[PDB]
Curated annotation (Swiss-Prot):
Kills a number of Gram-positive bacteria. Acts at the level of cell wall biosynthesis by interfering with bacterial peptidoglycan biosynthesis. Specifically inhibits the conversion of the lipid II intermediate into polymeric nascent glycan strands by transglycosylation. May interact with the peptidoglycan precursor rather than with the enzyme. There is a cross-link at residues 4-12, 13-18 (Beta-methyllanthionine (Thr-Cys)). There is a cross-link at residues 1-2 (Beta-methyllanthionine (Cys-Thr)). The modification 2,3-didehydroalanine (Ser) is found at residue 16. This is Lantibiotic mersacidin. There is a cross-link at residues 15-20 (S-(2-aminovinyl)-3-methyl-D-cysteine (Thr-Cys)). Belongs to the type B lantibiotic family. Maturation of lantibiotics involves the enzymatic conversion of Thr, and Ser into dehydrated AA and the formation of thioether bonds with cysteine. The carboxy-terminal beta-methyllanthionine undergoes decarboxylation. This is followed by membrane translocation and cleavage of the modified precursor.
């Protein structure tokens, strides 16, 4: 997250907002 905007603990499509 954010979904599309790599914030803190995720990349665009990579993390809990997508898979994880």
């Amino acid at each position: 997250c954010x979904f599309x905007l790599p914030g803190g603990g995720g990349v665009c499509x990579l993390x809990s907002e997508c898979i994880x």
